[PDB]
Design a protein around this nucleic acid. Structure first.
Ligand SMILES: [Mg+2]
Ligand SMILES: [Mg+2]
Ligand SMILES: [Mg+2]
Ligand SMILES: [Mg+2]
Ligand SMILES: [Mg+2]
Ligand SMILES: [Mg+2]
Ligand SMILES: [Mg+2]
Ligand SMILES: [Mg+2]
Ligand SMILES: [Mg+2]
Ligand SMILES: [Mg+2]
Ligand SMILES: [Mg+2]
Lengths: 62, 97, 45, 51, 117, 175, 48
RNA sequence: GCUAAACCUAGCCCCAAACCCCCACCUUACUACCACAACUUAGCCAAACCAUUUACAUAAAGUAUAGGCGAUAGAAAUUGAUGG
RNA sequence: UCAUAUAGAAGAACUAAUGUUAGUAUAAGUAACAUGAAAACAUUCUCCUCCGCAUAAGCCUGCGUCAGAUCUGACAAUUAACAG
């Protein structure tokens, strides 16, 4: 089995470089990107990464 | 409300098509074939994962070694960043030292 | 009072952001190429 | 359904064309030819004296 | 601050508004003091024929036979242009049969095109 | 003369006028250059008339009477253009064997892209042209990287169009 | 099935063959046919 | 009772294979038409500061070796290689 | 694989991160905004302005007609002697 499931982490999704708004001034929650897992359209914090192999071999006698 | 109202269409699975009727055939090609071949040599899939397993860091390292020089520029840069991050994480973060 | 920092001028706009000013330096050609890659249909001002 | 013909190992000697560019550096030379001779006999076509 | 709309002669200050043409050809040149000299040669003199007595009209009747698309190819043109003269003269050194080796001494050069449709 | 910009007055406001068949390419190929000239100008007058009529209808808020004549004359004029250009191209191949009438050359823009550059007939030689020597018909090194990314961005677009085109062949074979 | 109008050429003319193949362009032949005479020779230009 | 609530596919992700593609436009780009030139990655980051230092097939081997002999770095000889 | 059960898997469970996106509330029908007078819709009257007309710069059809509405579509236009 090779699981061909990939989900774009927080650093593989398009854009997302700049700090949306300064930390202190406004009254909104602190954020350092518009692509955190928190945000809509962001990346999965813990998702299927890359094609995954599940190979293993039992003793031939078994 | 987050629950559908009508019933979904029925997903009909044919338990006796060719792919299922012949699953596993030749998974003992070694023991029953004078060891000419090995089971791993039937794993169809990526060049860098046929018959090998590991965590994400090892998988990415292996991908870089075997097809790193064939990858598109942006994919390869993403891969290098991913290796850098995973190195930092697996080697410095965690409950257990 | 602020907010009116843009006093429009076609000569200035075409001189300091135009096609020829980009193409008159390696950095500008890089800018044009970035905007060709990203798909833009407004490469130069 | 008749199961597909079994997976058999690549018969005979494996001579890769040398003009191609993907054929790796180690599949052309004296060592690979020596291995093919040792593993398949005179049918491999290697002249013994090269060994 | 508008960069999507086309850029045409109606846009800039006086200088720009004047310099930028509108797809229109030129026919002359500016002399001293913004004076314009026109040249009778750079003005396309139309060449209209005499249409009197002509037996063809904008359309063709629906009672016409069909045929096959046979685009004219260099071989087809050569076949009935010069070949029969060759064959007639083959029964008893190429310019005599219409060949034109060089195209400097003719008014309508074929390559490059020095004339107009 | 100017009266010729409108159809025969008998046929004003008729909402139906019968016209023949647009000239076909093969029909023109039997005509001499002179007759093709005269045909060209007859079609010119007709197209001017129909354009006037169409614009007037679009001004009066009415539907044009039989707007098929317009496309018929447009197609016939395109056909005559094709026939004349074919005669010209044949004679060009015979007389100088060149393919394109207007000279040109394959060059590289400043962006690395391979372009076909059409030549602009000038009067002084190319080395003395202060404007044409400001153009860069070559590509410095900094573009090579951008030449790669582009080549990749248009391979992805290819792959997605292929892979998808096969998924839609599985679904079409699963109903 | 159909009868032609005033702007529809008869079959006798739409199918007549008056094209004798010739080694001159449309321009070269029509100039001679309509008797317009030109003698000044075209100058030389520098394509590039 | 309103507001709504519901739906499928348009497409996409990861693989495999195969090496991929008329006119105008560097002047104020999309303007028919006149006398110079291109050719060592620093540092965020670890050492709980920081200053030398700090990573970018399988096996041999995390061995030899390097290192405020700290953090860490690290070979070779030889071995053999259409799908979800 | 039975064809809800036995297994194998995994982006596998939200009363709370001034979380993010969308919906609707509360403060609230609250704060704030606007149209000189009469009429016979032609007109007359009262009052006000450092304002108005043009070029330049800027903008690019942004109260012209018609037809649909309470803005949408179609049609029309700005004619070089002034300026470049
Ligand atoms: Mg980023
Ligand atoms: Mg941050
Ligand atoms: Mg996403
Ligand atoms: Mg530190
Ligand atoms: Mg249950
Ligand atoms: Mg979860
Ligand atoms: Mg919350
Ligand atoms: Mg209150
Ligand atoms: Mg109030
Ligand atoms: Mg004017
Ligand atoms: Mg003037």
């Amino acid at each position: 089995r090779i699981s061909y499931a990939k989900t774009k982490t927080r650093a593989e999704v398009r854009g997302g470089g700049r700090k949306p708004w300064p930390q202190k001034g406004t009254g909104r929650a602190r954020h350092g990107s518009i692509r955190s897992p928190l945000w809509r359209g962001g990346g999965v914090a813990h998702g299927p990464r890359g094609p995954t192999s599940y190979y293993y071999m039992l003793p031939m006698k078994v | 409300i987050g629950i559908r109202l009508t019933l979904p269409p029925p997903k009909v699975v044919d338990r006796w098509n060719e792919k299922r009727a012949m699953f596993g055939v030749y998974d003992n090609i070694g023991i029953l074939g004078n060891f000419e071949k090995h089971p791993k040599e039937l794993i169809r899939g990526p060049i860098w994962l046929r018959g090998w397993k590991g965590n994400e860091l090892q998988r990415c390292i292996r991908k870089r070694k075997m097809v790193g020089s064939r990858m598109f520029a942006d994919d390869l840069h993403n891969l290098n960043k991913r290796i850098r991050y995973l190195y930092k994480h697996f080697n410095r973060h965690g409950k257990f030292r | 009072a602020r907010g009116n920092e843009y006093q429009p001028s076609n000569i200035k706009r075409k001189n300091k952001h135009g096609w020829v000013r980009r193409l008159s330096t390696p950095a500008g050609v890089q800018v044009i190429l970035r905007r060709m890659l990203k798909g833009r249909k407004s490469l130069s001002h | 359904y008749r199961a597909r013909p079994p997976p058999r190992r690549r018969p005979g000697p494996r001579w890769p064309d040398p003009e191609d560019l993907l054929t790796p550096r180690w599949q052309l030379g004296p060592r690979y030819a020596a291995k093919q001779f040792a593993r398949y006999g005179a049918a491999s076509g290697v002249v013994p004296g090269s060994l | 601050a508008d960069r999507m709309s086309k850029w045409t002669s109606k846009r800039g200050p006086r200088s720009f508004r004047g310099r930028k043409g509108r797809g229109a050809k030129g026919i002359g040149f500016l002399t001293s003091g913004w004076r314009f000299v026109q040249i009778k040669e750079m003005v396309p003199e139309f060449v209209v024929p005499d249409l009197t007595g002509f037996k063809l009209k904008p359309y063709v009747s629906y009672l016409a036979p069909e045929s096959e698309e046979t685009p004219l190819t260099a071989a087809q043109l050569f076949s009935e242009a010069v070949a029969p003269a060759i064959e007639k003269d083959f029964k008893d050194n190429l310019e005599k049969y219409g060949f034109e080796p060089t195209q400097e001494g003719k008014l309508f050069q074929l390559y490059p095109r020095n004339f107009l449709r | 003369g100017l009266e010729e910009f409108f159809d025969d007055p008998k046929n004003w406001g008729q909402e139906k006028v019968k016209s023949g068949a647009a000239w076909t390419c093969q029909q023109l190929r039997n005509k001499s250059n002179e007759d093709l000239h005269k045909l060209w100008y007859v079609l010119l007058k007709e197209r001017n008339m129909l354009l006037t009529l169409e614009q007037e209808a679009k001004r009066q808020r009415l539907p044009m009477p039989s707007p098929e004549r317009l496309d018929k004359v447009v197609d016939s004029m395109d056909a005559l253009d094709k026939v004349v250009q074919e005669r010209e191209d044949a004679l060009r191949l015979l007389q100088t064997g060149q393919e394109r009438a207007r000279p040109g050359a394959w060059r590289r823009d400043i962006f690395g892209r391979i372009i076909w550059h059409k030549f602009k007939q000038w009067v002084i030689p190319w080395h003395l042209n202060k404007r044409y020597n400001r153009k860069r018909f070559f590509a410095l090194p900094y573009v090579d990287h951008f030449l790669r990314l582009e080549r990749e961005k248009r391979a992805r677009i290819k792959a997605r169009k292929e892979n998808l085109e096969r998924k839609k062949a599985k679904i079409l074979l699963k109903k | 099935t159909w009868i032609d109008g005033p702007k529809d050429t008869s079959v006798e003319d739409a199918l007549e063959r008056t094209y004798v193949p010739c080694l001159k362009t449309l321009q070269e032949e029509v100039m001679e046919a309509m008797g317009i005479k030109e003698t000044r020779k075209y100058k030389k230009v520098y394509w590039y």
